[PDB]
Amino acid sequence: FLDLIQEGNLGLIRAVEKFDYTKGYKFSTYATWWIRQAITRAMADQARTIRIPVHMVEVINKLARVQRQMLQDLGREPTPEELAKELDMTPEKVIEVQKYGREPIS
DNA sequence: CAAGGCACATGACAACGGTGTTCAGTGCCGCGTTGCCCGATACCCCCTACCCGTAGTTGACTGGCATCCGGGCGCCGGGTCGCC
Numbered sequence A: 001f002l003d004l005i006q007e008g009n010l011g012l013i014r015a016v017e018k019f020d021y022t023k024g025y026k027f028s029t030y031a032t033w034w035i036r037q038a039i040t041r042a043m044a045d046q047a048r049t050i051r052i053p054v055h056m057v058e059v060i061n062k063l064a065r066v067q068r069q070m071l072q073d074l075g076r077e078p079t080p081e082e083l084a085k086e087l088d089m090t091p092e093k094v095i096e097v098q099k100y101g102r103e104p105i106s
Numbered sequence B: 001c002a003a004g005g006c007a008c009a010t011g012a013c014a015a016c017g018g019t020g021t022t023c024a025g026t027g028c029c030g031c032g033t034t035g036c037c038c039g040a041t042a043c044c045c046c047c048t049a050c051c052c053g054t055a056g057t058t059g060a061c062t063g064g065c066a067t068c069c070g071g072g073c074g075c076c077g078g079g080t081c082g083c084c
Helices: A002-017 A027-045 A054-074 A080-087 A091-100
Strands: none
Touching: A002 A027, A027 A054, A054 A080, A054 A091, A080 A091
């Protein structure tokens, strides 16, 4: 949590370096975008021991959330081809990404 | 009866007979050391579907997350507070 706070501070100094009053709004609408950017980058870059690249990271999170949506809607484990279709990828890429998203066990 | 004269054979005389030798040359016909001619395989070339790093996303959206117990003992040791 506290490292996330520091990374948000980093995004804040970045955003205020790139803010001007020309925008006809408050700070809270401009800075928050860059804070979100910095936190997302940190969570994608230094979260996993076996580091994944950013593109694969968003692949993992998209797969996880859409799979959770499938479970919520259908209430059953969807067929691999079904998940492949909602993702539009192939089943081979599906098993690949599923294996790439594990965590080390101590 | 003795001396001098002619036959046949005889001491050597070389040169053929015939065979097995000295060099020597060159092969004859068995064993070896390196010429082919290829054929494959390692090393250059171009680009391209994808991997990986970076840049933005304008209503606003301003303090988490705690912990929480049935040891239990026992001592050391020092710190803090009390005494005065």
